[PDB]
Amino acid sequence: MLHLLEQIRAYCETCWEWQEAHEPGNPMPAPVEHQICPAVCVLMKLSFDEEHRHAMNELGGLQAIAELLQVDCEMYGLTNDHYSITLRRYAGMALTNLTFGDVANKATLCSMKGCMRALVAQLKSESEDLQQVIASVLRNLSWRADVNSKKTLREVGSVKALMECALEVKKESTLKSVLSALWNLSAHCTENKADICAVDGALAFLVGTLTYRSQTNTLAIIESGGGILRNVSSLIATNEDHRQILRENNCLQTLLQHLKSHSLTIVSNACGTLWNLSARNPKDQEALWDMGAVSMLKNLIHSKHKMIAMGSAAALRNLMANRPAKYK
């Protein structure tokens, strides 16, 4: 047992004293001089083992690491410093592991409102490795979040920041984390869904994910990207402007193409998106009639999968209930 918590708690005190003296209105503490980055590197690597996590949680090691991340971001901001990014990366990684599978640690971290503002701020960072880790923290916090957690996650503007961040991400590891969090947050409330669509170029990007050539022979990004689209497609149905963006990016053809997929989540997201999209719009209804959607949906009603069986039948319901004039 090494109490690097005490070192970090002591380091944060020095930074807080400095912040009190140097308010919004001389020499600043540097974490290289106290060996903070090697100290947090250890605490990051200890958080993988759940026995050490049990020790960390009683002592208050989540707080201390969240205090460190926060104060460093507050002081130095969006820097490209080797030491300052790595410090935050490991801090976030330890926070990813402390938040994992832990109802209490999710609730506390979210209630630490200053740290959450710092977290969201770091998505505009030029380091995509940090973006990936910050997304990973936000992903876990958005997973099975209590009322207060969900409220604060919205409060801080984490959806808009994640979606904006997602548009400029160039790595697939990063984009996987970013979309996972957005998938979670999309299921929280209707205002989150509204915010995802409110961002410019956002819906267009999400149609792109459906036909995304992955490297590394994996489907996770198409699963999560379409999974987001499915959640928000509820509010897309009542909005004509957004439907037009799906039309012009060949969304519906791809959705019907995804019904023939070997992945089971892809097919599920497709059926749920078509469920929402097949209601209330004559032209998209007629479009799907024309594309052979009715014969495609009839295959999938006898599947041993609650949400493929429901999704296909609920969508097929809407199509048959609003049959076009041509088909008579």
Partner: peptide
């Protein structure tokens, strides 16, 4: 999206 430990 689910959840996970750090990579």
């Amino acid at each position: 999206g689910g959840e996970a430990l750090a990579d």
